[PDB]
Amino acid sequence: MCCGEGSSCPKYFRNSQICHCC
């Protein structure tokens, strides 16, 4: 699950990575 192409943004919920950026 990528949340952003050309981006280095992973999303965390509390402390759980819910996605990363592509």
Side-chain angles (χ1 to χ4, degrees), residues 4-19:
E5 71 185 80
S7 302
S8 180
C9 27
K11 292 179 54 183
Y12 285 59
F13 189 94
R14 291 175 64 239
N15 280 146
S16 310
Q17 188 192 91
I18 43 173
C19 77

